[PDB]
Amino acid sequence: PITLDEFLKLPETEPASEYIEGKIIQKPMPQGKHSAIQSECVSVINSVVKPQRIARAFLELRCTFGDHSTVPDISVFIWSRIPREENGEIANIFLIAPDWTIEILSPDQSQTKVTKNILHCLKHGTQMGWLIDPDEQTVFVYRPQQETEVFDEPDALVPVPSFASELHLSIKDLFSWLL
Amino acid sequence: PITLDEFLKLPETEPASEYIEGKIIQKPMPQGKHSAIQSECVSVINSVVKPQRIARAFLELRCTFGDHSTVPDISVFIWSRIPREENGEIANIFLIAPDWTIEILSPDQSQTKVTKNILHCLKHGTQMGWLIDPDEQTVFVYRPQQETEVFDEPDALVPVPSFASELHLSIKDLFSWLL
């Protein structure tokens, strides 16, 4: 029995807490496999979009919109959508959906909760969602009003939003980050 | 290292074995919660579609198509698509996709594998897929070329294919089958 406004006054937790459909759900504990893919994924995206100020990928950033407050594993925002203070530095609060959300499964994660979170992002303007399953070496690709797409062939390139089109990431390259 | 033709010559297992993307994957072990929803779900669908020979819901029926051989928890076929022998009785082999596939999660089930199986059905003519998550009291609804839809409000009706439009099943009714 808690509202979003009430939830946002509460202190941060480790792992972070999400406010989904009126419920407070704590994110899963960090795991080796999860961290390896997460850190390398942010690094590879930013190497492609950050130099020419196209976009920026953020680790564990809180996104509050559409009566939910979530913490995607990776949130990617195009430059024009990054909220900034008057001095030009990035704002502490993000009240908008990412342009590209990336979720990586870990043993204690709820795949149903993650899928709902990705679909909620798409409902509020997200261009693309990625659901990475390390165990199955699979990526589910989510686009607004389109059937979920499956990528699991080692040589297959995983689609990226058009602002990140210079990124050519194969399934084999992604899951090699576990090695 | 096995083909579909070779796989189909092999003996049946308990739990049943599926042939997906050239791999043999055994279904999860039966569980109480899973069986309660599965048995009641087949009963409720057939009470709506079997009397007027609209369709028929089958438990654990093997469906072999598009180089895969799967065993959906529940397969629903419209009357005109039920394969029949010369004498008019239902055939032992189904070489086509169900009109409606229903998958119910259980503790050892791979939600990624199930989603791939539902999406493979849609690629070969299935009208609708249901992914029931008893633990999260959620139903994911899959339609060809449409974004996945989420149903989790207790009073919400879960969509059904138009041949089964007389079925009005709420989320609360579905998960009450666990009580």
Ligand SMILES: [Cl-]
């Ligand atoms: Cl910046």
Ligand SMILES: [Cl-]
């Ligand atoms: Cl999906």
